[PDB]
Design a binder for this molecule. Structure first.
Ligand SMILES: *[C@@H]1O[C@H](CO)[C@@H](O)[C@H](O)[C@H]1NC(C)=O
Lengths: 1253, 106
């Protein structure tokens, strides 16, 4: 069943029921205008709107253009019969298209049902129609028949492509916001459509070209219908409730009014810009209005002005407002049904839902402004089908939304000249001249802090009882049909219906052309530096903005100097074709570049050119940009820092019931539930603030990146075309070059770069959200949790205390996880948030790492990282920090005071890699010295050391102390914990236990539940305190703190990640290095050392022991290691300029005998699988297999060497075979068929203390 | 034999390389600093309360010799038969014990 029945053409007679001359209300006297009814209470008037508004009597453009991004003005539109018929067909087709959709069907049914309320009677016990909510259709006989209607569609006013929904007001009553409702006249035109540009679609169609998409008129008509539906039930927000912004700064939009009504109508992302408190206020206000009108309906008992019985009218209004009578004629509202109706009219009917149902493109947010005016034709079915629209099926327009792309579907949209000039509303920026005008619609959107309000501070009292397409489909089944208010005979009114439109608030004109004087080159300056005029003279690229803005015929570019040198070079025809291909290759190379440094937290893909592209942070070096990025987080991208402040959350007042057993458990359950509700509400408020104030800037930066890339591509294309133009005719025809393919490939390269830029910006936005916004709310929530826990425990103070205490302790000890999926519905951002949550390090609280010649807290919780003047950093790997026993060899960490909560350190983890040299002096015995301190007022946790012991101490105010110790002996042949890197992690849970793991294996655990008040601290002291030994020192690196207990799996994952398996390691655990002599030790036989025997072909190398003994009585006794012939590793094919060896490197091995080097080689032709190794003079024969590939992974198994032949055949793993009595060294292929193939490199170290005799 | 026993008290032997064989002697409160015993024979010689210092023992063969209450510091015992049982109540300091001749030799 179609919506509009029996299509009307235009020139059908004046019958009087479906096509007739009508007289709408107006200020004075108006000639009757032919209007056609398309459905119940819906009329269309194919005429220009010059009747309702007496001021709008002219069709010429006004002298002062409106604050509008795009607008088309016309005078001859809709003046001919063909134009009116085309308008009618377009409107009817759009109505049918909306009606087909289930959501559209519900919207049209609701609009038809919702007639305006009859409140025109002065006496309170009567119902009378509003005189301004009705029309007069004049019959051909001569008299008129006054009729009541709901919607009217009129062609647009002077502004052709300005669509709005007007209403006729009353003298005292606000019909559109008090629930009474009033008729809505929509100014809509289907022949014209705004055009936008979309740059976030490549995720589905990478083959797509440029943007320039055309808005589907069905969506616009749906938006107007939603406005009419809101105003028909009288629940529209007052127009003065407007989303105010700031305009003083130079980076702010001069003026952009957006009422709360538009935010409600847009829905989706836009509707989140209004906090929950204002939604609650509006819902309560409109509930009170509905109750008031229900009471008014109840009181009245008489009706004047119509034949129809009163009971029918009361039933009509009851089914419109979903009132609930109780068989006694007593109408009343119920909260459930009104909540359902309000949610349907506010949240279900939204433009985003219509976009999803129609499956068409639209601007996801109102910030993505329109750009052009497109004249379109809707009547023919070959251009716009009823079911699909511009995306016609079974054609090339079916996929990738090619039906809405103006550059593919050119024949369907005609571009028009919009009257708002590109520089009509601008801001004039310049430095201390070169002043540039920047369009107002190309500036950052900065909402004020007034629009966000909180009721968090206000307290709450608890008593016994204190409490998606599938959802749309469920509403569709639940919806009621088949009941549409039947047409009612109304006694005819006066010939002229006097009535004035609803009064609108006055909008002051924002000032134009404000002059700003700054001290730096802003991003708009860089963007306007890259533009040019497509002039006749040659255009040359340059790297100096100070000259690009000054000289019109020279364009700035952020690419490398080689590219600008190339594109500026005069090339003959014989090399032109090669030149173009080289140019496109360099374009792809520069745009697709990425940043290797990844130690950053989820900013893995850093795009360097962005720095010089916009002058981000006011540095013009890509390396400087990456350094500043790593140093300062995602703050440098933001133009202005949002100010987020959560008030102290209110307390929970618990009522006590006398001698009751069930209600108290209900109070406890209610308290826990409301705790969860408070957590969710604070998280939602923070998400709303972040979406309103942060993501908009990132989106603008993304759009500006796209614009800059387009500008660079256009500049290169213009240079190429100008060079082509210079040739002679024979040169052009012999050497043929076309522009379309070049443009297509440059566009594809731009898209390829744009994917990476989008990923980087999404990662930055999510990182900022989870780093600089969430903690400020988590602190408040957990402080509130601690405050509520004591009140609950006091409240428990019948016969069920133990279970309740366990429940409350376990409930409030932990925290509710933050999952973004419950607050936003953006797939692209949710994927990156899941990636952020995946890594454990990203959720750490303190993440001290050395990056870009600075020791910084990558988790951004620390305020001051103070470094002493006697703290050493290893030059090869600067992460390893060496701390001495000096008063000035300390590191201090001062955390942010507004992030640290009092009840921290209840469930938390710590992890660090530590290297402790051997204990030499006898003073070290029975001497405990703190190496990490976080105690204030004798309370907190400290990591201390002792003779062969690592101690973790937890102490409370009452002087109670709990210690967990890990003890390793020094009197062993070979030790895995003496002067070797060990990964110590400690996990404390206040409820059950505190445990310490060494190298990812549980070592010790002890209860801590007896402790009292462990009052948290703020400073962290990396300093050796109380150590009596004067030369004592330690190595510490990769310190990390976590705000939750860590299970064994996470500990093992941390050990695997931080181990850095890509780099082979020596005995002590450092990085293996080239051109360094290491002694060799075999793990299979650690009691024997490698020795050489008659260097040359006829000699070999074997293993002989025992190693020996190094002793200090009463202190230590360890087998000597600096024994045997030293091995050095000379590079062979490593392209890296550093001397650090890595996995699968190919290397040469030299053995030192009598301070002379011999290459480690063998002859592989000898019989048997075993190939005994030998040492040969470096001027040897290259035919012998000598190249050794070093491996450290299979799971990692130490450091293994694999002898390879010169032809790539694998001779096999190095190792030892007991070839007769003498245990020789061999390259065996048995070891390749996986011990004895695992080796350890022992370099001379100053922490071991053995003298290499 | 026992009549010709040489008692040594308060010695200060600095930078001396020992190459011959010394027999039938006792040393008390000796301070052997930077000495060197290479390829020699120890015969019926006793050390008590002697303070060694960075001395070097190489290819030394001992018979009935016994160290007592000696402070032995920074020494190297390479290619020797001076096993553990020849040391009685002795304190080593930063010392070492490398390859050691197998079996006693007389
Ligand atoms: C005594 O020392 C000297 C100097 O090194 C050496 O030439 C000589 O051979 C040593 N005596 C004996 C018996 O070896």
């Amino acid at each position: 069943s179609p919506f509009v029945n029996k299509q009307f053409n235009y020139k059908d007679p004046v019958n009087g029921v479906d096509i007739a001359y009508i007289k709408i209300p107006n200020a004075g006297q108006m000639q009757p205008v032919k209007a056609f009814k398309i459905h119940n209470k819906i009329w269309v008037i194919p005429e220009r709107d010059t009747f309702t508004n007496p001021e709008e009597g002219d069709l010429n453009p006004p002298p002062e253009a409106k604050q509008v991004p795009v607008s088309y003005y016309d005078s001859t539109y809709l003046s001919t019969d063909n134009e009116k018929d085309n308008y009618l067909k377009g409107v009817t087709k759009l109505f049918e298209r909306i009606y087909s959709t289930d959501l559209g069907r519900m919207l049209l049914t609701s609009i038809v049902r919702g007639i305006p309320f009859w409140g025109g009677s002065t006496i309170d016990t009567e119902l009378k129609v509003i005189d301004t909510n009705c029309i007069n259709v004049i019959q051909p006989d001569g008299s008129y028949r006054s009729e009541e209607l709901n919607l009217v569609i009129i062609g647009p006013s002077a502004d052709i492509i300005q669509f709005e929904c007007k209403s006729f007001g009353h003298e005292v009553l606000n019909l559109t916001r008090n629930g009474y409702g009033s008729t809505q006249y929509i100014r809509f035109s289907p022949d014209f459509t705004f055009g936008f540009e979309e740059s976030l679609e490549v995720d589905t169609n990478p083959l797509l070209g440029a943007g320039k998409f055309a808005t589907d008129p069905a969506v616009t008509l749906a938006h107007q219908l939603i406005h009419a539906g809101h105003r028909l039930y009288g629940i529209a927000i007052n127009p003065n409730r407007v989303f105010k912004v700031n305009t003083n700064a130079y980076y702010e939009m001069s003026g952009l009014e957006v009422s709360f009504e538009e935010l409600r109508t847009f829905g989706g992302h836009d509707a989140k810009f209004i906090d929950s408190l204002q939604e609650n206020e509006f819902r309560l206000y409109y509930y009170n209005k509905f109750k008031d009108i229900a009471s008014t309906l109840n009181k009245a008992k008489s009706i004047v002005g119509t034949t129809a019985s009163l009971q029918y009218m009361k039933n009509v209004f009851k089914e419109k407002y979903l009132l609930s009578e109780d068989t006694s004629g007593k109408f009343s509202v119920d909260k459930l049904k009104f909540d359902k109706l309000y949610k349907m009219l506010t949240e279900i009917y939204t433009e985003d839902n219509f976009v999803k149902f129609f499956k068409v493109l639209n601007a996801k947010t109102f910030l993505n402004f329109d750009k052009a005016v497109f004249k379109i034709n809707i009547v023919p079915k070959v251009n716009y089908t009823i079911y699909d629209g511009f995306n016609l099926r079974n054609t090339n327009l079916a996929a990738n939304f090619n039906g809405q792309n103006t550059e593919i579907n050119n024949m369907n949209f005609t571009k028009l000249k919009n009257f708002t000039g590109l520089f009509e509303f601008y801001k004039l920026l310049c430095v201390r001249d070169l002043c540039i005008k920047v369009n107002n619609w190309d500036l950052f959107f900065s909402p004020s802090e007034d629009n966000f309000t909180n009721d968090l501070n206000k307290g709450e009292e608890i008593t016994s009882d204190t409490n998606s397409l599938d959802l749309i489909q469920q509403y569709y089944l639940t919806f009621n049909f088949d009941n549409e208010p039947e047409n009612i005979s109304i006694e005819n009114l006066s010939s002229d219906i006097i009535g004035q439109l609803e009064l609108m608030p006055n909008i002051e004109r924002f000032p134009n052309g404000k002059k700003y004087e700054l001290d730096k080159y802003t991003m708009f300056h860089y963007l306007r530096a890259q533009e040019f005029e497509h002039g006749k003279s040659r255009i040359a690229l340059t790297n100096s903005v100070n000259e690009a803005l000054l000289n019109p015929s020279r364009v700035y570019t952020f690419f490398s100097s080689d590219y600008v040198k190339k594109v500026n070079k005069a090339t003959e025809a014989a090399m032109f074709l090669g030149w173009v291909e080289q140019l496109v290759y360099d374009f792809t190379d520069e745009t697709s570049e990425v940043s290797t440094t990844d130690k950053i937290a989820d900013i893995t893909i850093i795009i360097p050119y962005i720095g010089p592209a916009l002058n981000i942070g006011n540095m013009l070096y890509k390396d400087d940009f990456v350094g500043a990025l790593i140093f300062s987080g995602a703050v440098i991208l933001l133009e202005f820092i949002p100010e987020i402040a959560i008030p102290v959350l209110g307390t929970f007042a618990l009522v006590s019931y006398i001698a009751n057993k069930v209600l108290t458990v209900q109070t406890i359950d209610n308290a826990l539930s409301k705790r969860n509700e408070k957590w969710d509400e604070v998280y939602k408020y923070i998400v709303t603030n972040w979406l309103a104030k942060v993501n908009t800037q990132i989106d603008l930066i993304r759009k500006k990146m796209k614009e800059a890339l387009e500008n660079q591509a256009e500049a290169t294309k213009a240079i190429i075309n100008y060079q082509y133009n210079q040739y002679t005719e024979e040169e052009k025809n012999n050497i043929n070059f076309n522009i379309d393919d070049l443009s297509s490939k440059l566009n594809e390269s731009i898209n390829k770069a744009m994917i990476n830029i989008n990923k980087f910006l999404n990662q930055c936005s999510v990182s900022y959200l989870m780093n600089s916004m969430i903690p400020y709310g988590v602190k408040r929530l957990e402080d509130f949790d601690a405050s509520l826990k004591d009140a609950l425990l006091k409240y428990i103070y019948i016969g069920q205390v133990d279970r309740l205490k366990d429940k409350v302790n376990n409930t409030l000890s932990t925290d509710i996880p933050f999952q973004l999926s419950k607050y936003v519905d953006n797939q692209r951002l949710l994927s990156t948030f899941t990636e952020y949550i995946k890594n454990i390090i990203n959720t750490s609280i303190l993440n001290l790492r050395y990056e870009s010649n600075h020791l910084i807290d990558l988790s951004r919780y620390a305020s001051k990282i103070n470094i002493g003047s006697k703290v050493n950093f290893d030059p090869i790997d600067k992460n390893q920090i060496q701390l001495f026993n000096l008063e000035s060899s300390k590191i201090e960490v001062i955390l942010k005071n507004a992030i640290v909560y009092n009840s921290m350190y209840e469930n938390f983890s710590t992890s660090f890699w530590i290297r402790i040299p051997k204990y030499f002096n006898s003073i070290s015995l029975n001497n405990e010295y703190t190496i990490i301190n976080c105690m204030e007022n004798n309370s907190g946790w400290k990591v201390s050391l002792n003779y062969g012991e690592i101690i973790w101490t937890l102490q409370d105010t009452q002087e109670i102390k709990q210690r967990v110790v890990f003890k390793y002996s020094q009197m062993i042949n070979i030790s895995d914990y003496i002067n070797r890197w060990i990964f110590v992690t400690i996990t404390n849970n206040r409820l059950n236990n505190s445990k310490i793991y060494i190298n990812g294996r549980l070592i010790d655990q002890k209860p801590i539940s007896n402790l009292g008040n462990i009052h948290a601290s703020n400073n962290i002291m990396f300093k050796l305190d109380g150590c009596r030994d004067t030369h004592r020192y330690i190595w510490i690196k990769y310190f990390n703190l976590f705000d939750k207990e860590l299970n064994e799996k996470e500990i093992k994952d941390l050990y695997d990640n931080q181990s850095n398996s890509g780099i082979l390691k020596d005995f002590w655990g450092d990085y293996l290095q080239y051109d360094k002599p290491y002694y060799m030790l075999n793990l299979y036989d650690p009691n024997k050392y490698v020795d050489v025997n008659n260097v040359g072909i006829r000699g070999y190398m074997y293993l002989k022991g025992p190693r020996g003994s190094v002793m200090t009585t009463n202190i230590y006794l360890n087998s000597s290691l600096y024994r045997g012939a030293k091995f050095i590793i000379k590079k062979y094919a490593s392209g890296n300029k550093d001397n650090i060896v890595r996995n699968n490197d190919r290397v040469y091995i030299n053995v030192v005998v009598k301070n002379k080097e011999y290459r480690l080689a063998t002859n592989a032709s000898q019989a048997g699988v075993e190939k005994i190794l030998s040492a040969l003079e470096i001027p040897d024969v290259g035919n012998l297999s000598q190249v050794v590939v070093m491996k450290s992974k299979n799971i990692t198994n130490k450091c293994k060497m694999n002898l390879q032949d010169n032809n790539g055949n694998d001779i096999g793993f190095i190792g030892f075979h007991q070839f007769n009595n003498i245990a020789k060294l061999v390259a065996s292929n048995w070891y390749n068929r996986q011990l004895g193939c695992s080796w350890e490199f022992i370099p001379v170290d100053d922490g071991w203390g053995e003298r290499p005799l | 034999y026992k009549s010709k026993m040489k008692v040594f008290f308060g010695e200060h032997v600095y930078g001396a390389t020992i190459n011959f064989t010394m027999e039938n002697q006792i040393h008390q409160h000796g301070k052997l600093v930077n000495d060197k015993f290479t390829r020699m024979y120890f015969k019926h010689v006793l050390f008590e309360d002697t303070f060694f210092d960075e001395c070097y023992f190489e290819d030394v063969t001992s018979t009935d010799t016994y160290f007592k209450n000696c402070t032995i510091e920074s020494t190297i015992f390479y290619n020797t038969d001076l096993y553990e049982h020849k040391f009685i109540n002795c304190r080593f300091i930063n010392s070492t014990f490398l390859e050691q001749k197998e079996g006693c030799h007389m």
